[PDB]
Design a protein around this ligand. Structure first.
Ligand SMILES: [Zn+2]
Ligand SMILES: [Zn+2]
Ligand SMILES: [Zn+2]
Lengths: 65, 266, 115, 46, 134
């Protein structure tokens, strides 16, 4: 369901980091706990944000017209 | 220099750790707040949709577009649509972007904040540039689409502050602390056994002298020296989000005098 | 639905003035100023400063009810000293202190290196 | 230039008028949708 | 926040926090009468009866439906339909008086017995407001 732009809690941009995070996982083979720390997502308000998003949009796209 | 002094600890392009010293808490706070809420900035605020086949519904997208940070260096030379004299809007009060995306790729095509396209004359001024800090430089994945999915809309960014809606806030988190060693006794730690042991010390305990038993209780002890850290989203240079903060607040305190004036005529 | 307009938080509506000063009848030489379209930000500060003019016998402010962007400020001063002035000073002071804080923040900043 | 209705599966602009059968020119799939408006719709951005 | 009520960060609600979508679907068919008497989907008016609604029919095309991008509201008619009886008695469907939003998807099908089957779908985004439950 597409990444949230910015953190509900503190407003700090977060719409870009989606793809980066997803590779710092599949590629760079890192753990979430830090893959996030890497993307600069310091405190939990922003963390809980990425760490939790459920990119449903994909399953959506996969339909048709 | 003369009154309330500063002393920037670390400092970057996105944060500005620093020590506001010899001020009034009220003031430290006033500024603290002004930063979060009343600093002018630009953002998309109207979205005309010509075509959308995405899976995301119109307003869904529209919503996001408002959060995609935009350039706001020279915002202070762009007027508020509401004060400008045009029947609605002009280059004198707004920026106009574009967005057209087509699922050409055989594999999920991506719409990014970079795909925006200013169409209004930026009358020569830093404004309306989809702020990018992305590594590849695409910033803010607006949305995705499949095969023949199309998405054509137009945007119209205007001035506006955080009180009107958050998407105009430039701040986004601000660290604020003071008197790390509870010396003024402005709190009362909860504990099971030992306060000191169970409650972590702050990275700021350093920059201030520890308590030391014996000494009685400093009651006349007020509170100056605040360990702040002003982050930013980009729309404005972290330094500014502090100067303009400092300024904006100043103007408000100003208008109050000016008010006391016209009110003096009668 | 019954939502007030977001901008009403700061745009003075048709025929309202930021300030409005009414003389408190309860005590002598003291007044109540209503600040329209404003909040704690401004209030708490003008209250603090106002709390230094040692010729200011009383000073406090309150936001009537969250729903409404506005607050009342009661200022009581020593004889022969009119509070309107007391408010004036406290205002200026704040400006002056801020200005300093600005020059100074800029000083330190210019003398820095980013990474 | 212009259209009106569409095919739920084999998405293909179609249309017609009264008693023109409610099927598609290929897929019988008797469903059919109605394609957006000419009128451009605007949206608040908050 | 007293008595089981809470305070909710406005800013967060803005940046999104808890917004939702909301669809609803009105539906209609063309009655048939053994002795070939049928209703129709159209944008009527006067023509004897006046037995029609009060909501703008305008948002109505000629198939007696609303284009999918249209913003609807009050009791505008979402579907035009007439019944023959002895000339133009209405049978159109206005939007639920209390709701309002944007037409989202219209669709026209046949129903076994070959009559015109149609369903409209309006969508609304509902942002968390003060009386809301969580
Ligand atoms: Zn955050
Ligand atoms: Zn203009
Ligand atoms: Zn077909």
């Amino acid at each position: 369901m597409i990444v949230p732009v910015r953190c509900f809690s503190c407003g700090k941009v977060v719409g870009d980091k989606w793809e980066s995070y997803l590779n710092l996982l599949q590629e760079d083979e890192l753990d979430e706990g830090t893959a996030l720390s890497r993307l600069g997502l310091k405190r939990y308000c922003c963390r809980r944000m990425i760490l939790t998003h459920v990119d449903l949009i994909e399953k959506f796209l996969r339909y048709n017209p | 220099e003369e009154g309330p002094q500063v002393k920037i600890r670390e400092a970057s392009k996105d944060n500005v750790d620093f020590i506001l010293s010899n001020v009034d808490l009220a003031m430290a706070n006033s500024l603290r707040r002004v930063m979060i809420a009343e600093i002018p900035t630009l953002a998309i605020d109207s979205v005309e949709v010509e075509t959308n086949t995405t899976v995301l519904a119109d307003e869904f997208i529209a919503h996001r577009l408002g959060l995609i940070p935009l350039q706001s260096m020279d915002i202070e030379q762009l007027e508020y649509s509401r004060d400008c004299f045009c029947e609605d809007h002009c280059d004198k009060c707004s920026v106009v972007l574009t967005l057209q995306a087509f699922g050409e790729s055989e594999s999920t095509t991506n719409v990014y904040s970079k795909d925006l396209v200013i169409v209004s004359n930026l009358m020569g001024r830093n404004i309306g540039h989809p702020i990018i800090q992305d590594k590849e430089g695409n910033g803010v994945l607006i949305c995705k689409l499949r095969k023949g999915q199309e998405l054509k809309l137009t945007c119209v960014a205007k001035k506006g502050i955080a009180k009107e809606h958050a998407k105009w806030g430039p701040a986004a988190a601000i660290e604020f602390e003071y008197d790390p060693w509870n010396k003024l006794k402005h709190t009362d730690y909860w504990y099971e056994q030992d306060s000191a042991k169970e409650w972590p010390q702050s990275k700021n305990c350093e920059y201030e002298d520890p308590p030391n038993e014996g000494d009685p209780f400093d009651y006349k002890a007020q509170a100056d020296t605040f360990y702040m850290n002003v982050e930013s989203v980009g729309s404005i240079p972290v330094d500014q989000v502090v100067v303009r903060g400092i300024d904006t607040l100043q103007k408000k305190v100003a208008s109050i005098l000016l008010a006391l004036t016209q009110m003096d005529q009668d | 639905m019954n939502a007030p307009d977001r901008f009403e938080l700061f745009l003075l509506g048709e025929g309202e003035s930021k300030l409005k000063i009414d003389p408190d009848t309860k005590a002598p030489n003291a007044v109540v100023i209503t600040f329209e379209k404003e909040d704690h930000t401004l209030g708490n500060l003008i209250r603090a400063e106002l709390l230094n003019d040692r010729k200011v016998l009383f000073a406090a402010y309150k936001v009537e009810h969250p729903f409404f962007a506005r607050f009342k400020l009661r200022i009581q001063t020593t004889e022969g000293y009119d509070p309107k002035d007391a408010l004036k000073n406290a205002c200026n002071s704040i400006i002056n202190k801020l200005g300093a804080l600005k020059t100074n923040f800029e000083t330190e900043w210019n003398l820095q290196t980013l990474a | 230039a212009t259209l009106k209705y569409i095919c739920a599966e084999c998405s293909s602009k179609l249309s017609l008028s009264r008693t023109d059968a409610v099927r598609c020119k290929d897929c019988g799939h008797r469903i059919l949708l109605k394609a957006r408006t000419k009128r451009l719709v605007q949206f608040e951005a908050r | 926040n007293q008595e089981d009520s809470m305070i909710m960060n406005q800013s967060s609600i803005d940046r999104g926090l808890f917004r939702s979508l909301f669809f609803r679907s009105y539906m209609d068919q063309e009655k048939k009468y053994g002795m070939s008497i049928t209703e129709t989907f159209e944008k009527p008016q006067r023509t004897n009866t006046l037995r029609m609604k009060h909501g703008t029919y305008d948002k109505l095309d000629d198939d007696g439906l609303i284009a999918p991008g249209v913003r609807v509201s009050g009791e505008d008619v979402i579907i035009g339909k007439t019944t023959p009886i002895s000339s133009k008695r209405d049978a159109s469907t206005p939007l639920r008086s209390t709701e309002n939003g944007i037409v989202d998807q219209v669709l026209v099908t046949t129903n076994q017995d070959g009559l015109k089957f149609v369903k409209v779908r309006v969508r609304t985004t509902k942002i968390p407001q003060i009386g809301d439950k969580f």
